[PDB]
Write a protein that binds this ligand. Sequence first.
Ligand code: ZN
Ligand code: ZN
Ligand code: ZN
Length: 163
Amino acid sequence: SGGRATQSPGDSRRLSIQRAIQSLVHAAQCRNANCSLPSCQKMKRVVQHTKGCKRKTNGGCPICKQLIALAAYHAKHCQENKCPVPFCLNIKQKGSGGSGGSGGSGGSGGSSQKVFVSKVEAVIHPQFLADLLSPEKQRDPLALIEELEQEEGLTLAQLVQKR
Ligand SMILES: [Zn+2]
Ligand SMILES: [Zn+2]
Ligand SMILES: [Zn+2]
């Protein structure tokens, strides 16, 4: 009757995905000016990126990929067709798939963004997730982002060529 979750290194970072996803939903429908929360302000930036973006799904910007990842992962745990979450909407119209995600409640995340099924999660780069969750102020996701697209050249590409 549900359940069935194991706390892998991935789980913890998928939980950071789900946690940034919790952020996502919030900034997606936050219209309270009195609210100036850390995860909210940083995500207000990251969300506003998703809309004012052009290289969105072209694969250039890291955000929109990890945001269609968040919004998708989120969309799996979402039952709203008229959702506030941006890419959740286009998920229901384009990104069709099953349910699931993670939920083992692990806290020992690690480099597991290769072995896993990279169907949803493109360049989520949990550091970005972590920074949203961080009470710190000048710890912006979009700052990480430009860093992330730089590091998008490293790993997976590492020793990938073969015969
Ligand atoms: Zn807010
Ligand atoms: Zn973008
Ligand atoms: Zn949604």
